């Protein structure tokens, strides 16, 4: 299959130069914008640092593929597998501390060096594994073959069963949290609006007392979901402070004066409630779109570098087109990250157009 090794490396070099240009662009936008540096920003920055560590040496892979076999020494190939390994596990543990920080930000420097140390531990465990096995007369560089296999198996078990299921648990918790918080603002605005129409239709059979008790329960929940913080709570104290005023007059049978206090229900609803329910809706919709960036960079890191890794283990423990289609997938992920940032990430789309119009 000479045409496979003939048509990989020009594509490899183009995704290499595109990835290194895009990631060096990412680091000069951090080098200019050092003010709003969030924890997400520095974690994806360390992911970018691992990406430019991986990004320089795809020409070595390209001229290894172009000659038909490996050219340099075995230590060079061990270094190449080591830097691919620190790229993979740096991405894994950086998304893991991303899950850490978004859990402790939504649900309720040193760790970057910890991520680098775990990466270099992975680099050592793939340093002791790699050797150029010249099988069938071709000097390829594939890791193949008692305590080392068991150590690799337990490291795989830890670094697959803990962080992947941790991603599943934390991201399902977030998308069941931020969807339910947006849902809780929907029925609270619904029964504050629907039952106000029932009150104006409640001259028939005294459905006034049944109606405001539904609004008494809903507007207590919306109060539970700083000078600006004082105005948020105070806008609901007069809202249900005129619900019981229209319930005191509902107990005495004054239905006509209950409707007179129902006209004051809409006044506080527009001047205090509709202002802050929309303001809470825009902030909630802003944080649910930043999750969509975090979800996309996680789910494509497991759709690109993971199926190439699961085909490396089965070919080492013991169909070449299945190997070939995976060997272009994980290496594509170095350049694929800045592609996903402009068309999904709403923050990066702002300063990218600002740089183009500088």
């Amino acid at each position: 299959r000479q045409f496979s090794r003939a048509f990989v490396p020009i594509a490899y070099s183009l995704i290499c130069v595109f990835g290194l240009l895009g990631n060096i662009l990412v680091v000069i936008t951090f080098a200019f914008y050092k003010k709003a540096r969030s924890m997400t920003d520095v974690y994806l920055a360390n992911m970018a640092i691992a990406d430019i560590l991986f990004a320089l040496t795809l020409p070595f892979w390209a001229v290894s593929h172009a000659t038909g076999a490996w050219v340099f020494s075995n230590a060079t190939c061990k270094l190449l597998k080591g830097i691919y390994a620190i790229n993979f596990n740096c991405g894994m543990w950086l998304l893991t501390c991303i899950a850490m920080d978004r859990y402790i930000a939504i649900v309720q420097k040193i760790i970057c060096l910890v991520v680098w140390g775990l990466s270099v531990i992975i680099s050592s465990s793939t340093f002791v594994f790699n050797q150029k096995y010249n099988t069938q007369g071709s000097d390829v560089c594939e890791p193949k073959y008692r305590w080392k296999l068991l150590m690799l198996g337990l490291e795989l078990l830890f670094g697959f069963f803990i962080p992947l299921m941790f991603m599943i648990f934390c991201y399902t918790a977030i998308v069941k949290t931020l969807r339910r918080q947006l849902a809780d603002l929907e029925d609270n605005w619904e029964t504050l609006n629907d039952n106000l129409k029932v009150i104006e239709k409640a001259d028939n059979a005294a459905q006034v007392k049944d109606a405001l008790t539904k609004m008494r329960a809903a507007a207590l929940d919306a109060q539970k979901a700083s000078p600006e913080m004082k105005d948020f709570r105070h806008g609901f104290d007069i809202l249900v402070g005129q619900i019981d005023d229209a319930l005191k007059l509902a107990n005495e049978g004054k239905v006509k004066e209950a409707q007179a206090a129902a006209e004051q229900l809409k006044t506080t609803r527009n001047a205090y409630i509709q202002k802050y329910l929309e303001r809470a809706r825009s902030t909630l919709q802003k944080e649910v779109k930043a999750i969509r960036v975090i979800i996309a960079v996680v789910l494509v890191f497991l759709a690109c570098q993971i199926p190439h890794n699961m085909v490396l283990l089965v070919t080492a423990a013991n169909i070449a087109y299945t190997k070939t289609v995976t060997e272009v997938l994980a290496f594509l992920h170095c350049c694929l990250n800045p592609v996903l940032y402009a068309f999904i990430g709403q923050k990066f789309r702002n300063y990218f157009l600002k740089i183009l119009k500088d």
Epitope: A217, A218, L220, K224, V240, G241, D244, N251, E252
Partner: antibody, heavy 124, light 109 residues
Framework: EVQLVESGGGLVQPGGSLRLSCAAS????????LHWVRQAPGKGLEWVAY????????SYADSVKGRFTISADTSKNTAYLQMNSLRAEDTAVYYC?????????????????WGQGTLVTVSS | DIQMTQSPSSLSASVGDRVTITCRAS??????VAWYQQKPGKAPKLLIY???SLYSGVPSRFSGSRSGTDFTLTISSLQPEDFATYYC??????????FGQGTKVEIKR
């Protein structure tokens, strides 16, 4: 401390009348709504009535509407519950509890301080 | 018109056990549910207010939680003084307070 006592409990005939007192010391009636909670002997608690002294709003439960009369007196810091036509299900212990006013945290502390209540038994 | 159903009618556990009592409202009652403890021959005492905040004076072993319209009182460590009757109550309005059926916590034997 702030506390509430009750009085006026005893034995009446069916169809009779009885007025329980509820004396509150340490706090004013105009700052806290006053409730009567009824516990039948061996059965669960049941709310009966409330009076709001500032706004003059009184309300009753469905089993005691018309037969029961609640009132308050800020001069002696007392609340009175007057009952007429006491039927055979009305023998129970009556507790006098306080409750805060909206807004703020005293509305959330529902029935924080209770009285010991009085036994009202009806029989012929 | 709001009915609260207390699910355990009689509850039996010994000293040191963790017990839970659940109550369910008919409609939404927001976070306005209180939990009362009544010893036999005495007035009830307020334990939990606003379904999560323990009262100033009660011990810290009593806790409350809300899940929609399902309210839960949990005692982590039972004591000899903890054997009494427990009532759940919605307090959405002054004229709509309804109490639960009651849960009697006896001694496991």
């Amino acid at each position: 401390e702030v506390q509430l006592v009750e009085s006026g409990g005893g034995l009446v005939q069916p169809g009779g009348s009885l007025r329980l007192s509820c004396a509150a010391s340490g706090f004013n009636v105009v700052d806290f709504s006053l409730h009567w909670v009824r516990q039948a002997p061996g059965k669960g608690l049941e709310w009966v009535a409330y009076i709001s002294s500032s706004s003059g709003s009184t309300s009753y439960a469905d089993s005691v509407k018309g037969r029961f009369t609640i009132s308050a007196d800020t001069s002696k810091n007392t609340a009175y519950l007057q009952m007429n036509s006491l039927r055979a299900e009305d023998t129970a212990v009556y507790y006098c509890a306080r409750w805060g006013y909206w807004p703020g945290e005293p509305w959330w502390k529902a029935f924080d301080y209770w009285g010991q209540g009085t036994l009202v038994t009806v029989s012929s | 018109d709001i009915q609260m159903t207390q699910s355990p009618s009689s509850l039996s556990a010994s000293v040191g056990d963790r017990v839970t009592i659940t109550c369910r409202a008919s409609q939404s009652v927001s976070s306005a549910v209180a939990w009362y403890q009544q010893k036999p021959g005495k007035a009830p005492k307020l334990l939990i207010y606003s379904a999560s905040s323990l009262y100033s004076g009660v011990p810290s072993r009593f806790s409350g939680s809300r899940s929609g319209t399902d309210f839960t009182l949990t005692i982590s460590s039972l004591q000899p003084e903890d054997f009494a009757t427990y009532y759940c109550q919605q307090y959405l309005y002054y004229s709509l307070v309804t109490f639960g059926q009651g849960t009697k916590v006896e001694i496991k034997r």
